[PDB]
Design a protein around this nucleic acid. Sequence first.
RNA 1: UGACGGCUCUAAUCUAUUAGU
DNA 2: ACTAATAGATTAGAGCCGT
Lengths: 412, 452
Amino acid sequence: ARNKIFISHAAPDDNDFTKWLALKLIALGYEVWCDVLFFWKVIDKEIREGAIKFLLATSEIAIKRDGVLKEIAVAEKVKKQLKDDNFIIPLIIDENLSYDDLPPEIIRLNAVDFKKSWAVGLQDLLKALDDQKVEKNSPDPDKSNALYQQIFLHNKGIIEREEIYDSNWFSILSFPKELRFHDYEKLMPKGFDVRELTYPAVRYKNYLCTFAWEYDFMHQLPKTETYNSSQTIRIPTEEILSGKYDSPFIGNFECQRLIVQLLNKAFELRMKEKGVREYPMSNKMGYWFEKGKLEKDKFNKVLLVGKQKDKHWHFGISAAGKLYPFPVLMISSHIFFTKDGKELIESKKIQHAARRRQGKNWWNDDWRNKLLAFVKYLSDDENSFYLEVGSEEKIYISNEPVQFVGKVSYNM
Amino acid sequence: MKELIYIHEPNILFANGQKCADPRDGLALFGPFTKIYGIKSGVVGTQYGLSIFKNYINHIQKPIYNANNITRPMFPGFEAVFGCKWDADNVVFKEVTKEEIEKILYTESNHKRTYDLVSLFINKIITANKNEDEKVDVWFLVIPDEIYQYCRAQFHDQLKARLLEHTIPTQILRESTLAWRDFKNKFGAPKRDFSKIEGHLAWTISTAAFYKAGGKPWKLSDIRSGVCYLGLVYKQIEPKNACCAAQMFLDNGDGTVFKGEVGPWYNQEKHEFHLNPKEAKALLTQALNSYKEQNGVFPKEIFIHAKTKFNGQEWNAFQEVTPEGTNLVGVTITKTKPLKLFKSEGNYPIMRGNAFIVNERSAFLWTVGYVPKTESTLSMEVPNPIFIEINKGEADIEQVLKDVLALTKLNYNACIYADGVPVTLRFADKIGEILTASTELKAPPLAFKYYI
RNA sequence: UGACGGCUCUAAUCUAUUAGU
DNA sequence: ACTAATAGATTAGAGCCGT
Ligand SMILES: [Mg+2]
């Protein structure tokens, strides 16, 4: 039997109204038939046998739409056979539609007003439906729930394919197998900075902890020639990496702290020989390319130094190596700005403002490509790059970041 | 090859207990969990401000269509969503003259300037509440731009703070927001363009007004029963810190109750962002007693979370005041270590809800990502995930992730898809910003309606 | 302060170690 | 005991732009 309420309207524009109203009517127990909710033969079929009401979402375009007037024309025809004057109900929604441009098949009828607020119109619509004794089922949120999801709460679906995510963690490929604690307390002249040594080294207790050997420090550390190379404490790094090493001389936490300090100092030092221009941050160290150092100021077909209006933007990175969860080199992306590609703008506010605007242009792929290309410049061999910590002691960094795979994806 | 586990989106209850994942869709389709009869407006502004407010209310009476209707859902209209009436003609208007604002602004003392600017509005609000028989549910303060830019010991913080003893829900609306079209930065275009996001603005303002007027737009249900999700925030006073607590739990009727649990807990210490044992014991006794009075029995778990890590002494105090049969879980949520995941091939960020498990005691959770529901990612740039560390106690690192993700979905101050940080922490932050903006209160109200 | 988010700039604490008071 | 330095750590804030 005819127990369905046909809803007609413009296909590309009136979707929002009809979707809300159809879902609203479905939630109330009615049986609604909307093309968006759910071919011309089929459309006519319902209006000719299945439809019990013909609600016309009337607007300044729904009355100029050739396909809608055809649905009206068949609706006028069906209305006559049913001997029901109350078959077509003109829901007027458009603000500027004012009862003088209505098509002649609807002008003779009284609309249901939705121009001022949808809620009263739905209140008006329901009143007309009950006044006309349109049957309706129970508003059970079960089969109705199905339509709701089929419409929106099924769209929530999460495509279950596998994706690969490129992070900004670069693992440390290798460490020296042994950590050495030298003794130059009697050999360390007063006022000398441990940071000025050619190799990274930290003054822990009455010792000097570094990954270099004793004679590695000779020009920087004088009297080390006379120093007995047996005045040093040896500690397997892997033991401390596992946390096993925990002697009263030094704890595992402190030893890993010193390892991190050596890593950061070594990264800072290598950047000096890597030929990258440094820009100081508040609490970290940024590195970027002086204009002209790269070929055509770009690498790996990815532009790393460019121009923004009167200023030159320079992609920059800052490295902080961490041992947790596992030894990696956390790299962070930055943008540095110069006047003519030579010297840095000395206003932090101006630099921040320039970056905030430049950030709009770049995207996910834009940041990934720039980061990966900038890291690949650091590469010494084919698949990594080494950081100097001793004369013959190297630490190897993968030039590719760690890949993370996920079981979840979107339409993209 | 590193494996990322996925945490699915939780569902939030709506009218008749129906579930959805987006407030902007769940409300527009189903309606609020609890319906109010209507909202009596209250306006403290100029004639210009009153005209703007009435224009905006009548504007949100009609449906609001934003440019990208597909990605951000449109606004049906206030009564069409919430089911109550919000008319612009029921305004108990209290006029503020630009001249009295001008004489206030000319005072040399900046602290006295801001105190007097707060005092004008709050005293007019108090006068109307005690004199006008017209019941006002929410007082909407249409402030001009001169207040916002000249006055900068904050106007908003003190204004919300100095009304706490009277318990008056308030909503500040800068006239730049309501009249954004007629507020241009001399170029001929609006200072901030709401054109493509007008519908979302209507959503946010209407949701804030509905919440502050006694309505509950939506409630949560995808959280473990018997657990009191409790959040601490520390705020600086210059050398004192100020702890504020917010608690969320399921009741006997299985209804989530989200309420603040704040008591004064001031600590002056060299070692900052830590509580003395007395303050911690007070904190926990207050929360446990609140749960006891709401539900009768004691919680089966006290899921304490914070942006900082707990030391030994305060945890021992926590355990000492805790009864038997109740477990304590202290979780630290940090958002500082940059772990930016770039998708290999594509142009849209990692999906929200992905989680990287470090180990049995830590994880990374992407509470900000790309949500297919709106097709609009919550982050313009690459989203930094939150580091969830089970500092103390025993817990399942995936259960904690899903619990935090659930707690990220109760921001009533904005009708966004979900919050980047758990809501209890953000609302406790707001409380701390407000409760520390005036004199100490004997008993601050425990309803967020007065704060947000 | 309708909001959210990224970022930038400061600041302190904690811990270790040495120096000094 | 207390100050200074070198760190990394852990937290605050202030703010400034984007949408
Ligand atoms: Mg608010």
